[PDB]
Amino acid sequence: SMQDPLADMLTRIRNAQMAEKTVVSMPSSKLKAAVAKVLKDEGYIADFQISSEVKPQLSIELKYFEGKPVIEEVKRISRPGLRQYKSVEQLPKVRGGLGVSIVSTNKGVMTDRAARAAGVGGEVLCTVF
Template sequence: MSVNDPLGDMLTRIRNAQLRGKSTVSTPASRLRAWVLDVLQAEGYIRGYEKKETENGQGELVISLKYFEGTPVIRELKRVSKPGRRVYMATKDLPSVRNGLGVSIISTPKGVMSDASARSANVGGEVLCTVF
């Protein structure tokens, strides 16, 4: 099946798996997805992920979701920049999610990073998603 927005698809899979209380969720592998998962893991929103090879050679990312006392750690996961409407922001305009309690994931020329890392590196870029 062809997906127009692979990152949006992964975020929806995570959201749906957490609503069902699943411990893991799998998604087709890509470098962008892995970079976003690296940021989510560094910020403490997921336990981790691992890449597994599939029979067709595509590869698959198996994401271990994180819960605290039975409730998902990720309360809100929103896609900001979409294929139909890209959202780019300068360093000074980077959004603060819930007064700094959440994280924006930014794709910058220096790689995919959180909003705090982008501010400290003084780079702007495409706002991929927000997490709270």
């Protein structure tokens, strides 16, 4: 009985970049398949595939610019039981604008740089460096 799916996608990513894996495969959803699209366009993974029929999977390939990986830390903000909501003024900035922060707004899941341009607040998900 797992209570939160999206803090389990991020846990497998953080663990596989210490076993120095390349491909990671977890079950999918219509939210996890949209978060990995955002991490690809910002650029942290190689690609992703939704390839099955009745238990649809998510196969993510990871990057290594060095022996050190490209993602160095990631934490879940709106843990189920806290539900962090932010307007555009109080919306956070990670590392002076060098990390990414993923905010579920009225116009779809987009990063903090995009919704602040459109002026739409919403709900934070994570703070990836």
